[PDB]
Subunit: 59 residues, 6 copies
Amino acid sequence: PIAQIHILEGRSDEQKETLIREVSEAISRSLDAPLTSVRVIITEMAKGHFGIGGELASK
Amino acid sequence: PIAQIHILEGRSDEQKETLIREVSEAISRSLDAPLTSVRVIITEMAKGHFGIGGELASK
Amino acid sequence: PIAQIHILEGRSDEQKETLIREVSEAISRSLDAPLTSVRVIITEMAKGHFGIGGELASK
Amino acid sequence: PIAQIHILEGRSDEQKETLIREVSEAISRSLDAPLTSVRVIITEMAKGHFGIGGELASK
Amino acid sequence: PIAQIHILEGRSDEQKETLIREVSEAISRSLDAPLTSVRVIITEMAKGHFGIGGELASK
Amino acid sequence: PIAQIHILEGRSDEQKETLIREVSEAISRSLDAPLTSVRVIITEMAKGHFGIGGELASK
């Protein structure tokens, strides 16, 4: 399984390290797949690179 | 947050519904973000559309 | 520019042909880029492959 | 609907803010979906991270 | 390394198996990375799900 | 054809220029598609943005 998570810039390294571990276990147990096969990719978005309803994430 | 998970075809609806819930909570609690903002997308791959080390996932 | 839009299954061919044209012009004029360089990709999601807040798109 | 647009680095913030608004309305009206549900993500590519026909975007 | 290739529907299984092997070696040797670490994902697009310059891939 | 390759940060410009050329030819010849139609996108991941088996790529 391969997960790509898009998050807004601003979290700490520990926070993202945690996210990678948590999401990785959730996939593993949800699909009964070996954890070692799970691959996660975090992609940060600049507050000005994310639109919601037409408005920027930043405002 | 927006997560897109790529999984091989073959799981049941219940299994994928569980995956979407689990992964969704893991992201929420890991980033302290409201669950209602989390968006998950499952993309299934045909066993013959996934390569590992050059070999097909199917063989 | 290359845009990949994820939409829930259910629209008509005409609707998606329109989406591809509209979005393609919006990118072109917004970035002053030649329309001929714009590439759009539509990816449909099964109602049961899209989660929002942990719940399935379908329910 | 969720759109991810890949563009080469170099545009101004106003230009990208415009792109996000324009593309967001185009999707909304094309699919008759509520604007508030539209999510756009801009991903910039370094001129040396984009290949066209085998050649770099930069040259 | 993880590559996701978007191709129009229509190729044979042998053709796609070849694509996965070729592209997988090209990445391996280009980055001097172990072939066993390379992961490829093929995503087919319906001729009516791909726009070029605003026009559908099919026409 | 459109390929998006995710690689860990650290390679040189020449190395990535090579990757773009190699992968681009591999796709071209594998699918008998004109090279000029091939589009490659490299996306670098920070060592702390890639998880394998739950552990960070960096450790």
